[PDB]
Design a protein around this ligand. Sequence first.
Ligand SMILES: Cc1c(CN2CCOCC2)c(=O)oc2cc(O[C@H](C)c3ccccc3)ccc12
Lengths: 215, 215
Amino acid sequence: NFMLNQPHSVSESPGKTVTISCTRSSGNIDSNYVQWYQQRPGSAPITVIYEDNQRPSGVPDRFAGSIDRSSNSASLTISGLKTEDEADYYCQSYDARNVVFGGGTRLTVLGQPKAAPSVTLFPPSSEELQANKATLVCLISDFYPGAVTVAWKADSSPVKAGVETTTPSKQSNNKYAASSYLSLTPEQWKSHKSYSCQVTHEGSTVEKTVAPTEC
Amino acid sequence: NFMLNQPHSVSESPGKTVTISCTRSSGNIDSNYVQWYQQRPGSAPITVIYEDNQRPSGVPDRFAGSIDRSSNSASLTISGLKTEDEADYYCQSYDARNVVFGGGTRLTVLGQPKAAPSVTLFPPSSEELQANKATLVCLISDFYPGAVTVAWKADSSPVKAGVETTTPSKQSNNKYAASSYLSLTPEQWKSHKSYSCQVTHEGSTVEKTVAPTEC
Ligand SMILES: Cc1c(CN2CCOCC2)c(=O)oc2cc(O[C@H](C)c3ccccc3)ccc12
């Protein structure tokens, strides 16, 4: 009944080499093969190492696996670190009455460059207006770090009701996305000259404006 | 290179029984051992079943594995559901050397009433089209549990390229919201009769469609 012990967390800056260790609590590390998994936030894990040091196809050659018999440990070494490498890493081996996992190591890559959001404002769709709804959506994408402030306007005036903004989540380009949506009635949408979505990120503000359409 | 097919999600109240299936696309389920892994939210994976029906020590007998040769499927049955059972469950097997994982099933132990999502599909805005962008947005709101699967189509064919979907987040009404966006060029948009957003929640699938128009 052995366990595998990994650090809860490690951090390193881009271009440098980071090592993540996995210690076996009883028996010899070389009695069974060690695998490593990478898991990105709210997303599907992949195998980066199998049979201690073998990379599946598609895994960058920057990932290397090793065993140290004297410490009864295994290591994942990532050289020339990239931003995309930020993830949780798990080691795994085998124990007669079990497949055994380490507790996971969260790898933080430091110094990621700031990125301003792409902002797109959508007026109400035909289909939702037919169903007596006039929800607007403001898509905010490609931003880093993962925090924004959103305000809406009805004509020039602040909107005080009906706004929701999703918690930003990290997408496949390693930058954040969120949507803000304003749940108008058709009467509210048609009774104003326009609505606006104002997005602030790192002290810069982007504002988009849409108006009732000519069909 | 057979596939293992699991349902996207399952849910029940505390004290109930739930079954998760795992269907092998080709070959005999019999030919190779099936493992089940549990990953609780924000936790490391643990093995709950190995060799089709063996429980590791510390795994309670409320967990049961089985094989059905006739349906070429494996099942995990959890009786006396507890709130700690909420997790992603993955089945796993082998064809010769190659390790194969199922897609995973989210199990929710219901903490509030079920709620079907509001799904709204927005066509491209005039302003993003002048920037050579025809991004579509699929807004998904007011849902519980928080698990959804999104798929896109160009006419009748599946898309994978250009799709991003946000991690669902709880909003001010204590229900989930998320958005999926498809990053088209105006040339891609105008060159199809339509595009579709398909949202699956709790074994209900809904589909919204938009078409390049001038009304
Ligand atoms: C999807 C997936 C993969 C990727 N392929 C999917 C098709 O079969 C071959 C492998 C994987 O390598 O490893 C996985 C591993 C999984 O579960 C293990 C227990 C795990 C590892 C780390 C975190 C969470 C779960 C679940 C899914 C996968």
